Amino acid sequence: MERASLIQKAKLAEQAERYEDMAAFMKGAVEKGEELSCEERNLLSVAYKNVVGGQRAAWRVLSSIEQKSPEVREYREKVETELQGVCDTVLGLLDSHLIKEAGDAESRVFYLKMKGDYYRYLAEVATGDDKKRIIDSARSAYQEAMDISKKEMPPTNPIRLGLALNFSVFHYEIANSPEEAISLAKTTFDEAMADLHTLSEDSYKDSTLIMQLLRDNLTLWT
Amino acid sequence: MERASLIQKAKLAEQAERYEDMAAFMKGAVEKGEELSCEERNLLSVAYKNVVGGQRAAWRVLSSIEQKSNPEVREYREKVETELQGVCDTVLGLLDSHLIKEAGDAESRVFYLKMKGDYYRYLAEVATGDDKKRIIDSARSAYQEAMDISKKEMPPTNPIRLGLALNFSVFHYEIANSPEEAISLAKTTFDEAMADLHTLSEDSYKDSTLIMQLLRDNLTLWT
Amino acid sequence: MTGPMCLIENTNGRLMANPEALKILSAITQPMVVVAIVGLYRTGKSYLMNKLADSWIFALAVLLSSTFVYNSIGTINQQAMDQLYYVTELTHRIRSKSSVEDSADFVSFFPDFVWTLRDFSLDLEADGQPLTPDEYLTYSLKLKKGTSQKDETFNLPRLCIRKFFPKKKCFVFFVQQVADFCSYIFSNSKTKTLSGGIQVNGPRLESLVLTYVNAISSGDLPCMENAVLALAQIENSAAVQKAIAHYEQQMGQKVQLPTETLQELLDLHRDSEREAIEVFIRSSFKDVDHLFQKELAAQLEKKRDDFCKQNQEASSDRCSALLQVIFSPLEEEVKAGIYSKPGGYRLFVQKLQDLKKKYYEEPRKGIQAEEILQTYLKSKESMTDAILQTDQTLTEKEKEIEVERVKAESAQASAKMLQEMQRKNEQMMEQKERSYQEHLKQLTEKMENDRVQLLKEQERTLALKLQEQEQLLKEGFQKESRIMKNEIQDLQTKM
């Protein structure tokens, strides 16, 4: 069908809270060849975030049941495999349709951050060596997004903050470096506050919510 | 795989909140040919109920958005319908080609006929024209048969009897368009439950009390 | 009160309790049903409250009331629900305990909710028959399917009202509608209660006001748990004082010093102590670590020691006095030589035995009777021998017999004194153990009663949450219904 309607069905999907359908529509809209607008971009991460979120939660529930004293493992693996399917789909979509397929610094950072997040999820369920490879491909994506944000965006831009937030989660929960996670989260927060004045009602609500998430993490981490 | 492990996976799936997987695990269990225990029957209904609960809520969003009448929106709603019907259909096959009558005790018999009434009811919601009429009939006959058995085999306080009565009344109001009949059933079902509760120990008091509340809430909202 | 008074002042951005109002509250000892009204300004709130006769104000109204009346003009539409952010914001203003989930406890202590809709413009017409205002409220709080930001915003305040308040009621508004609202309040509003079934009266409400306002003034969040504990500190301290007062009163009205025996005094102590502990137990609550009861125990022990000292002193005085009255005349007769004549030993021993008998027959000598007598008799031992050896009417063999008889009687007197001493120590030890067991007994009984009361409260919360879970499922919302099951599991870990 037409890109215009694909976009329309995703909005409907999100309304009816049918994220799997929503992610599929967006995927069809992406393969249409044309770049996505800011609005479209968010539809894409919201759809896939919800789909993958359910699987990640399922996985965590199961793996904990497995560790806490045959079926558990077999089922955890099924969920895990299904989760890796989605991540490879998102990553493929990014590598051959979205990443640097545009010009804007915001669109570029957004896509590279998304690449970091999905490699990060793949890292949550991987084991020895395969994990090291995945972890390193996650970091290079975050770092490249970080380099672009620090040169192209003010310290309060919500995308830059979302990126810095998730990159700190990466340091703490994946790269096993609590030290680095805490300082980046703290450094991102301060430089954010120090500019909050006249942050324009534009991205106010978003950056404000991410700033709170940064704090929650700092508290939980310390 | 072994029935026992299918049941275990259904329980793991429930904890993982993967109802679709759960439903498929209970379906495998049901196909083993052995009767379901009380706990197992509840696992089966929780599964499919959650699966269908999601499609319904989605269909109800897409419908109001469409406004029942006043492109894309139409096409997507129809797809959600097809899906809902698919789930309802496999539940009905499970009941008609396995669970119904292959059971002995009154409880289970009423439980499956109730379930049968429940899913024909979900099919009715998304049906129009004469299709809805035929569906409403088969839903009514299943609920009635369940009602005939509960009135004959169980006491006014049995939670399952109350549930059936509750759902049957909902059917009369939301589907059969017969409010009065829906109200009288609920009233009677509730009263008869009271004048017998003075002897109902917490050994099941909690159960009935929970459902009795739902009957009055509906009674209150229908008035 | 001839008329209303400001309870909490709001000046220059600061909320502060009015001392004059707190004073009035301290004087009202009867149980209170508290009804608070909130809503947009100029909506006829004060007018309606006379018929019955921002975020912090809203939160305080929730914390202090039995029934919370939210008043608005019009219908329950999007515009009206946007104003209910004040309810959603309660999760950021109120803390249930201090020891996304804390709000799961709100339904256990929040007031019943009543929505009063003024200048109502709908006929509520519906197929068959019209909706009642309560059914209209149910209709208005139904959720919308979807996960969009718009959907979440629509559902949030509705979910908060449905999940935070234990009961909901709606009234639309005219003279008869006001009459029906007042009748409902007068018949359904419950006495304000705190965890443990504690009924709030004037002094208790005063405490809550001070604690919550002080918290807000400190830049902290008002916490229900902290308020109950703060109240406990006050009442438990008073309970210890009341119990000690009761002990002192009972002992004073019944003790007669010196007591006939130590058992007499300890029996009275035990009885008074049991009554005192009962006074404390019924007047206290939330005595964490039993610190207050331990303080009471320490004070009663000191009180017991004081009575024992007074008793021993009273006995010593009485017995020493009797010694002077009974034996002094004999000592002087002996020193005067009255028994230094032929046959005087027999007369002396007979007199001495008669005097010892007299001493023993004197009433209520007390716990020092044997020690006082024996110490005296031993110190004057030489007197007997002096008279014996002097008497010539007694053969030497007879004197030898008497010396051995006197030695045996001295040993028996010593045994009476030694036993008196040993028995007293045993009785003190036994009383110590009995007192300890009495405290344990009453404490175990109170803890059992507290456990039952808490479980009862938890069962009510469980019933309310199960009810909502079912409504959500029946309504078709599994995502939210499943979230309820989560809160239910967490509640059950506490039971």
Side-chain angles (χ1 to χ4, degrees), chain A residues 4 10 13 16 23-24 28-29 33 47 53-54 57-58 70 85 92 102-103 105 116 123 126 128 138 141 145 154-155 158 162 164 175 178 181 185 192 194, chain B residues 4 10 13 16 23-24 28-29 33 47 53-54 57-58 71 86 93 103-104 106 117 124 127 129 139 142 146 155-156 159 163 165 176 179 182 186 193 195, chain C residues 3-4 13 17 19 21 27 31 36 39 44 53 59 61 74 80 104 111 126 128 130 133 146 148 157 166 179 196-197 202-203 215 219 222 227 230 232 238-239 243 245 252 258 276 297-298 314 321 329 336-337 342-344 363 366 369 386 408 411 413 415 463 476:
Chain C
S148 71

